[PDB]
Amino acid sequence: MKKVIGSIEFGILSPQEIRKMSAAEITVPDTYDDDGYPIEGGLMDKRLGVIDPGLRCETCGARAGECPGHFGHIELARPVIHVGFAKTIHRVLESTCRECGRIKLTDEEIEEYMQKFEVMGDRKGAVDKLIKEIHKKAKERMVCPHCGAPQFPIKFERPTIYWELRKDEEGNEYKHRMMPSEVRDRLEKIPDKDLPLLGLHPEKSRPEWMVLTVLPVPPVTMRPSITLESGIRAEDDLTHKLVDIIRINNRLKSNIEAGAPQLIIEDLWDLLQYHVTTYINNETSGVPPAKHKSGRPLK
Amino acid sequence: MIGRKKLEEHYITIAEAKELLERRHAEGLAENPEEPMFYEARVSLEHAERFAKLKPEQARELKEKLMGLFDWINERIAAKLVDILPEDYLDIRVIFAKEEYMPTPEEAEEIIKVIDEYRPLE
Amino acid sequence: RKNKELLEIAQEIGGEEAVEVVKALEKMKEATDEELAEATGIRVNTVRRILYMLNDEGLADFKRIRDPETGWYYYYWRLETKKLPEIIRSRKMAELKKLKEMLEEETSEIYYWCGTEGHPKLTFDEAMEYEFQCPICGKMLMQYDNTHIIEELKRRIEELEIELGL
Amino acid sequence: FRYTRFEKARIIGARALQIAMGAPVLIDVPEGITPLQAALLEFEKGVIPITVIRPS
Amino acid sequence: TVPEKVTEFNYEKLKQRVLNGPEKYPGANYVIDPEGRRIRLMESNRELIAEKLDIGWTVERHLEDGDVVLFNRQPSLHRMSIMAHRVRVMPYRTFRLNLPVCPPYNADFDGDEMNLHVPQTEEAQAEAKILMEVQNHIISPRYGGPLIAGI
Amino acid sequence: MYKLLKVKDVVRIPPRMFTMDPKEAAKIVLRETYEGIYDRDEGVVLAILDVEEISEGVIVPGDGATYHEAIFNVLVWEPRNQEVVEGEVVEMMPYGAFIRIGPMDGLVHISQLMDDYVVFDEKNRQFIGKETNRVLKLGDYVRARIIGVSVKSRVIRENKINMTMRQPGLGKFEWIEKEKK
Amino acid sequence: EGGLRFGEMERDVLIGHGAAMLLIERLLEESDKTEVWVCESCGHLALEDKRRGKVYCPVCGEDERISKVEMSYAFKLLLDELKAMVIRPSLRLKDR
Amino acid sequence: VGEKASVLARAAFEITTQHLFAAAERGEVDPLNGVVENVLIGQPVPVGTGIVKLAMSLPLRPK
Ligand SMILES: [Mg+2]
Ligand SMILES: [Zn+2]
Ligand SMILES: [Zn+2]
Ligand SMILES: [Zn+2]
Ligand SMILES: [Zn+2]
């Protein structure tokens, strides 16, 4: 009965949520096809949004004029690091100890920093000083209080690749590459009590959700197809790059599951990492802008 | 949810409820749209006419009396007994068949003795 | 025992082909996929598909080695088996939770059935939609149904949960 | 009880909108007058029943 | 035009307005039934609309002497550049502005153009006349002295 | 079985009845919002008994009407699971029988009536048992037990109740009496 | 058929007077206003269904009281852009 | 303008925001009560007339 907007609480979408708020799994990498009867089973109106003079939708009829678009999802075969959180992921990874889940601080030290969190609960500027001191103090240590210190290697960064200068033979310092699956399985161990001691929340923003497992698809209404002269359908940038995602995705599942020449997995993995980075931000750093065959960069 | 909060609820027998509907029926009686009671309300009235085994006031007296007979007889179960009007031990069996506790023949007869009054004699 | 249970789960996924894969890597302690294929006689593609599943369950490890003459990489696999009695639980905890959820559903649920050798056990929601005839075969719909197995499935799962409820 | 300028404007504004949708008018007779001008004469006689809840 | 929402005391006036049609000066352009569909008074007849009007409707009459209207010079530097005025209607094609109100707009008269917008909803209209009218702004908030005065 | 509810809600009183004491006034407005509606938690709201107390009015920017916090009494009907009810057979079908137990109807299928082989008399509208020659038709008084509730829509005509009588002491009242010896 | 615009400077002048009511009418109401049904304990925009005539939010199934919320069509599209990324814009409404 | 306000009160200032904007996505709220947030959403601003609340008893015999 006619309420108004009280507040807004930002956070991070969880994989669990994305599956219920999705209307259908997009699977057919194609656009319209062609000049008559434009109805497919993947990215276009598969209970997603209506734009043509055909009334079909998700049971509600509701013609293209005044019809809020519905979201979709894509079940990604492998985990994928989100580029936007990269810098923060570094602060998490090299400040805690692996296998335990502790913040590499004794209980006593942990206990007293709690009292600086209620006295500062409104001023965003002066809390950033206090987070970084914990950050800086944890980075210069090697003695966890719950694994007996077994010599903790140091992490690397920049732009999205990670390493750890370990020892394995007698004194070597090879650079073992890091895979998103590896990283993800290491963050789910960090208990919920420790997230306030970092820069996170226990319910709204879990750290493990930063590694994209399901990509939500924008609706049809937000992806319009502009026409050039009078018969040409100059497809939308969003649509093309999404189509590009499914074309590499579809070969990906079929190429690892059947034959396994191992080499393909290395090349294919980083390309997907490369490709998703452009979808989030085409003007990213260190990433060749994936343009359409005309020279015009995709926005 | 009905409203913000539910603050109080009470269990009512079918016989006593008939009067409230009849009172509500007597209102409206407003003639301007004539205001007929809607279908499901009209249906409930007819159903109420046939199953009222007791007088409105004497049902209250038994309802209070059944609550004070045993601690394990709450208001809903006692109100249900007034709606069914059990005649002997067999009716008590089928009502309490799916319940937590099954009354023994001894403790049932104490209840029966209370229900031995008020019986319509018809 | 400790050797035995690690061989049983891979048999549940791959089979006898996967039992030899786990037997082969424990023998050599560092191996490529070609070295594991020759010791058992299985093709190297069939061997390697089994190892990607154990990689996905956190039970197989590998560190890349640069071939200095050809410039390529070939993997040296090892084992990491410090997660054994918990994945035995942490699968079977939520899988018995899935078996909890089914038994809790079976109380207030499916009551009808078609009288054929196929398509029984209809819900009451579908029942009123069908208007008491079958749309699959056409037989007259019958009633209260599967009462023995909802007693039997109640008596199949409750004793499996006492073992793992500890 | 003397109103502030902002409270005065609001009261008139609220009262005027009620006068459009029904809500009987007091003695405000002359000749054809807009709903706004109706609220002005009623307020000039101090008969507006709307009281300002003061936050204190 | 402004919507008026006929109630009971201006019923007589509005009946004449909608009957006058869209051409003469004291006329009307639209009529809005309680359902919300706007009916345009143009096409071929306006008699059958101006029958029993039935209170609760809404007529959009032309601007008459006395409706509140704002006025803007555009660039809106100080606070005083938008002020509410009272409409008076005369034949020709320029806005007539009284001379002492031409320090606050910082206007001259060699072709400078001004715009005027008309608020509609009854709460908004009332609010404009009580709080922004010219007479409440003879003294300027910048310094303690009069701003609207003799030139 | 019925229930009496004392619930406080918020009522929007239109200005069109602004010259009338709030208790009667809010009562009419509130009444055309709840009658005829199935609230999934509690059930069929039959009728508003009365309005006990109503608070002061508050105006909100934009609407122009007046919001009040009222207190009223409601009469509801809840068919909770496995609750024993009594009703009257008001409809005959070749596959079941609709039994009005109140504001709604309760369907009991022919396979859950009695411990006996029941056949449908085609020429008439009745069920006849094989072994016992007991016949059940229109207008009979029965006693049954709720076995399932299907709460779909808010419309009373779209939710359906499932019951059964296949227990000792159920069925037509005349059968029960003949079986007691 | 166009005149001049009401951009940056024209909002700040009306605020100075204190005309809240006049402001809203001028800058938004002369566009489209779309009414959407928000879930109370979830925060995610619900979903209709014609032919049956009912609302339904994703996580909680009909039991939870969903409420109407009136907002500018421009702002609804802005939420979607955040929603297309991994950001969740939970709209926590508050009573009259 | 660079210091603390609400998150939306820096969204329409110096578009670069994709490093500082994602910062707020980790544990933060917002109620309202600015000026530009309320004008973007359609609510009455808290200055001016908006800061007054009315109340009125409803017998009203006209007389
Ligand atoms: Mg000039
Ligand atoms: Zn739709
Ligand atoms: Zn440790
Ligand atoms: Zn069958
Ligand atoms: Zn919800």
Residue numbers in the entry:
A (entry chain A): 4 to 302
B (entry chain F): 1 to 122
C (entry chain G): 4 to 169
D (entry chain K): 2 to 57
E (entry chain A): 354 to 504
F (entry chain E): 1 to 181
G (entry chain B): 1027 to 1122
H (entry chain C): 327 to 389
Q: What do the study's own words say?
A:
For promoter-specific transcription, RNAP and general transcription factors (GTFs) are recruited to the promoter DNA to form the pre−initiation complex (PIC). In this study, we determined the X-ray structure of TFEα and the cryo-EM structures of three forms of archaeal RNAP, including the apo-form, RNAP–TFEα binary complex, and RNAP–TFEα–DNA ternary complex. The structures reveal that direct binding of TFEα can shift the clamp conformation from a closed conformation to an open conformation. Our results support the universally conserved mechanisms of transcription initiation in all three domains of life by showing that direct binding of TFEα, a conserved GTF in archaeal-eukaryal RNAP systems, can open the clamp of the stalk-containing RNAPs.
To visualize the effect of TFEα binding on RNAP and molecular details of the RNAP and TFEα interaction, we determined the cryo-EM structure of the RNAP–TFEα binary complex. To reveal the precise effect of TFEα binding on RNAP, we compared the cryo-EM structures of the apo-RNAP and RNAP–TFEα binary complex. In the latter, the clamp swings away from the DNA binding cleft at 11.8° relative to the apo-form RNAP, and this movement is coupled with the stalk swinging (4.7°) away from the clamp. The structure shows that TFEα connects two mobile modules of RNAP, the clamp and stalk. It demonstrates that direct binding of TFEα on RNAP shifts the clamp and the stalk conformation from a closed state to an open state. Two α helixes between the eWHD and ZRD form an α-helix bundle linker, placing the ZRD over 50 Å away from the eWHD and allowing the eWHD and ZRD of TFEα to locate adjacent to the clamp and stalk domains of RNAP, respectively. The hydrophobic patch of the eWHD (residues Y55, F65, W75, and Y78) faces the tip of the coiled-coil (CC) of the clamp domain and the wing fits into the cavity between the CC and clamp head domain. The ZRD establishes its interaction with RpoE in the stalk domain of RNAP via hydrophobic surfaces (residues Y114, Y115, F127, M131, F135, and Y147). The D128 amino acid of TFEα also forms a salt bridge with K152 of RpoE. The contact surface areas between the eWHD and clamp and between the ZRD and stalk are 632 and 441 Å2, respectively.
